[PDB]
Amino acid sequence: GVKRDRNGKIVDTKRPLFTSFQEEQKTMPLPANCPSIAVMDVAENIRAKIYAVLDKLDFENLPGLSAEDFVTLCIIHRYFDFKIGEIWNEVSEEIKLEKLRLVTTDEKSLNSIIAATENIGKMVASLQSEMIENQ
Amino acid sequence: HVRHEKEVLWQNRIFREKQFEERRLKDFQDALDREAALAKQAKIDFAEQ
Amino acid sequence: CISLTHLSLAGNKITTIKGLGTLPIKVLSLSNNMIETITGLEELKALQNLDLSHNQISSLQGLENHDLLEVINLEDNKIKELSEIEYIENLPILRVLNLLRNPIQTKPEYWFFVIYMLLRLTELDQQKIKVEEKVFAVNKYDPPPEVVAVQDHMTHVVNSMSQPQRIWDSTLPSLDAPYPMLILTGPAACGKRELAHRLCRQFSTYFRYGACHTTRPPYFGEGDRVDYHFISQEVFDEMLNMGKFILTFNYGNHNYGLNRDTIEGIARDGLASCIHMELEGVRSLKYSYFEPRYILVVPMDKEKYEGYLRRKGLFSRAEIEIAVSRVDLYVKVNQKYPGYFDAVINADDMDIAYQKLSELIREYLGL
Amino acid sequence: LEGSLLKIYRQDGYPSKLFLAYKVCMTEEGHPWVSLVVHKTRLQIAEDPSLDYEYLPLVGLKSFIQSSLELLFGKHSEAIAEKRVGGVHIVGESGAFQLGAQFLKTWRKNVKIVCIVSCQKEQCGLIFQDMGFIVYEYSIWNASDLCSDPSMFVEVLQHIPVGSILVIGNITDCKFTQNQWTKLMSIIKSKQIFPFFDIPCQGLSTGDLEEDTKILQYFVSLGLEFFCSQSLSKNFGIYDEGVGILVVAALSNQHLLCVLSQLMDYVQALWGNPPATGARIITSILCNPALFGEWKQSLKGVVENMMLIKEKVKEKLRLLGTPGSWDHITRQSGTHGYLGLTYQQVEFLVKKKHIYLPKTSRINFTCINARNIDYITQSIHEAVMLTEG
Amino acid sequence: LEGSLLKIYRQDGYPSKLFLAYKVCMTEEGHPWVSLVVHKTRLQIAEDPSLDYEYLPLVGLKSFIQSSLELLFGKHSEAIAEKRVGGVHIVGESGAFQLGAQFLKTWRKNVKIVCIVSCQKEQCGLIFQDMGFIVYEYSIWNASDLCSDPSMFVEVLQHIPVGSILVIGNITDCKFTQNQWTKLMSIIKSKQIFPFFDIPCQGLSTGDLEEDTKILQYFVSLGLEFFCSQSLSKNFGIYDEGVGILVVAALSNQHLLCVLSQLMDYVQALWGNPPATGARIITSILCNPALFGEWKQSLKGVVENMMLIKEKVKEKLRLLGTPGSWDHITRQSGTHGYLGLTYQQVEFLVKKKHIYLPKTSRINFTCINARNIDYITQSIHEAVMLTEG
């Protein structure tokens, strides 16, 4: 359910990792024992495991360089940090509906986190366009 | 990680609860201390007179 | 005129006020005058309502001698200094204050500083000082114990996050059996660091000491990168700016913090870690999710610790009383809070402390 | 007092006498149930060299307060902070009732109407009639289903008058649905009923601390106003401590402070300072994750000790030929429940087998053990034979 | 309750600020002093962590209650053989009155009247009148004596109506003379008056239990109907745990049984079950002869320290030339004693010297030590000369 263009280019800098399931899901309290949105995926995915297996084999210096390889390598490399960012973003969105008011000290750390995440996403999109131009 | 820190700063709402808790401690004593001093003002006025 | 309960000379040419002395002038309105000082008024104790607006008054020390002064009005004057704010703070009855149109009125630091000092004020420049506003001014000036600790830890998290990261060796997959970590907190060098070193001596196959960092150059007797990471203040600040700090604590205007890589290096092998900790660092640690075994090491004999620090030599005169006060504070905090620390051991004798630590470790791991 | 039942049980020379009815949670050795974490925490507490010898706080211990509020109002509760609930570190266990009675006779003296379950008649009536409050009964316990049936509670919804002091006993089995619950509160709010709760055994009533008072969390989420009593030293293992907590619930924020302005004078004129040393074990489990977990599997062992042993005893009764599968025994929540045995069967137990129990056939299932489980099943079985027919 | 003294002392920033009324038992430095037996007491409580934690009944763990019974009865007298005397577990600083005043009001229907001391009314009679009572007052804390004075006491005794109750509270300042004992007895006999006593600081009112109870020993030898209010949270000093007892005397065994039954009912109402931690902590020091004797010796030493502080304050105030009599401080007994200060001296101390104490100035002299008392007396002398001059 992850969407790209007609060639495989990233189309988002805020939530590009949201699949169809994340998009159809909203912010509500979870069921009694049903796992969260990420738990079942992590138990049943091979997404974050490709990052680990590439790390086992020297992630950044291997033969077979190309545009698609560059795009996928960058996506998989930044996926860990940006997925942590997305988890804390969905935590913030749930807090938006919690109303269980927290101290404003929690707001500034979240602001810094989302600022860094947005900068990372925008630079990743620019670097996508940059390798496309290179090829 | 931050869920724990989210809950710890939820307990900082006790400080936010302490905001008015110690206002009460002072709002009815910042008036009595002013009122307590008025007890020594009118007793010597007519006494001197 | 001893019976003079009120006096009013507004709009006159009063240069300086004299002669009044101890008159029971409860209300004094002297606006639109040429008043320059506050002389003569200081003993007007019965003066609760003072009006000196549209005047030429600058210094206000002496109106604070009006132990009953409740309302002060000095709008449109030549007041510029903030010392009178501390002076009028000593008024337990000052409830209304007016300082508009003044040059002092231009620096909102005056505004929130009046709000902070004068918690007894109910009104400042014709507004009512609010409930949350006074402690907002509190959190604008002084750094709160738990709240400055919170801000330091949040800034640590912000700077550590803002850089690329990696799966840490200190984070083990086993949730209920993670990397074994130990924290021994207490006053300044009460042997708790020596206790940790002794633990690494006997339990060499179990533990390995973790050295805290510092902004301070190497003091004599302390091994570099073994007791403290004696780096400069600039490197200390930078390696938070580079995303490697999670905590700090300040001693003698020198900050001491923990780099994550210190835990990563020891956890990279599998042997446990032991680090001596301190109050501000403990606050920053408890605000975090980190899971060591919290241990407070305190010598209850405050006089013995006092003499020990005085005879240690490397400390000046004032460095002993601070540590004694910290000892007492730790004792009170741990004796008042149930289920607070995982363990607390005496530091009056290193031998009994180490015996207690050894039996605690043996009952922990079932050795 | 009428302590003579257990007293003559103690005087009973019958070796196989078994008072299976004293409500406190047991080990199978006849001791009140203790856990290893209790002895451990007693061991670490023994290392305290110095003392803070001043009066203990009256609001309660911070971790203890947080635990009490989250158990009685929810892990995700909002009424905890803005004084829509209450927690007061009272003396003993009946101190909450007496403070509430003082508040009633001071402010709510205009109402002398009390609506309760029949099992709470004498219990709460002692305290209420000590100040003149009239008590009215409805038996929401079922003498046929041998549990608390929701149906006569939906009838009691019409039975209850307006604006009474509702004392709640064992409503766990009165399992309404969520819409039925909403109808229940719509009836209550239309009658201005002010309820009074008491949860001294949270954790062992249903096996989960949340499920015991989950209906209470949903009560306070609607803005209800009610008092409550709570104790946790019982189901934990340290029974003898006996220091409870008064729990308030309301909507207005400043009114609780106004009530506390008088409660302070009350508490000063009544005791002044209750103890909290025993509560250190309580927090030692309820705060740390490893001890919380270990004591939770200890609780699950206790769960197997009553309700799983309930099932095994029932299977043994079926094997012995006891008519009817005593499923209501397993269906009764908590460690205590009526058997439905008549007077002439309780008397058979007490005389022939000297298995003592109150006249209402309400035994305590934590007293059931696997040591002489054959004897217990045989005693119940022969009671059924010789007294049912 | 405005506990302004300690809180303002803690929140003050003056380096030479000094508090003279620490709420608990003091060293020469301001620490929560304990007898050397408490360090052993904690160790000899921890030898039994494998307890099953059996409840405390309405009577409680009668080891503690009985030990305190022989305490307040006197381990030296023979009032027990008269089987007219009993006692009941109380909690905190007020349960003794909560039982005794309630019983006296309820069952002495013809006697709703008491003549009390006004000075110790703040501690005794406020709880006494909390049980719905009508009280006459003798304010024997004379202006000249600045301590409890038997003169106006016996003067009010003369005008006491037939069928009243007499209160002799924590006013050991009135070490009533033998002639005053006989005059009191003669006035009581002609009117059938019921004596009442309150010593919340046994071993602290004068130093030893027997000296605190000297006139109490005389009354016990007389064999009268009297109650003995007491709070072991203040005499032994478990202010944290907060546990004590009340003692009743009557003229027959059936009356004593009625007292015991009514007080058990009042216990079931007020707290139901007494706490165990404080009870066992008190037991550990009461039952053990070594701990009990050394506690008595050390408490006598602390009381003599208090007396030394009183004498030193008096002598330094008279030496510096401070106006007014000063032997009134030594006339006062127990850790509580006035200084006879005016509002102006107190306000000057609070403002400039940051020494906090009420106008009555009933300071705990164990707080003051021989190290800072010189500066304290100099500051008081300065306050008096600058405010009263």
Side-chain angles (χ1 to χ4, degrees), chain A residues 10-88:
Chain A
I10 311 182
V11 300
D12 194 2
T13 63
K14 190 263 179 183
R15 51 96 177 174
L17 319 186
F18 282 3
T19 76
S20 58
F21 198 87
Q22 287 83 328
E23 295 167 357
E24 59 86 16
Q25 288 300 328
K26 280 77 57 182
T27 45
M28 62 305 297
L30 298 177
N33 286 92
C34 184
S36 63
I37 311 177
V39 165
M40 293 178 71
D41 193 295
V42 164
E44 301 182 9
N45 62 355
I46 67 181
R47 322 184 271 90
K49 302 173 181 57
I50 294 181
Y51 175 72
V53 73
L54 291 179
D55 289 323
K56 302 306 175 180
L57 316 187
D58 183 72
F59 199 97
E60 300 187 10
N61 311 273
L62 289 178
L65 301 180
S66 64
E68 45 191 9
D69 290 328
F70 288 158
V71 171
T72 317
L73 187 139
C74 296
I75 287 180
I76 294 178
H77 196 182
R78 309 310 165 188
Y79 190 94
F80 157 79
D81 198 5
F82 192 77
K83 188 61 183 64
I84 294 189
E86 278 199 356
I87 287 179
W88 295 126

Side-chain angles (χ1 to χ4, degrees), chain C residues 115-132:
Chain C
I115 293 190
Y116 171 65
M117 293 297 102
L118 283 163
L119 299 175
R120 278 82 61 84
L121 271 184
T122 61
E123 173 178 337
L124 162 67
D125 288 330
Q126 281 67 245
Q127 78 180 3
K128 295 300 181 173
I129 310 190
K130 308 156 189 56
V131 170
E132 271 70 19

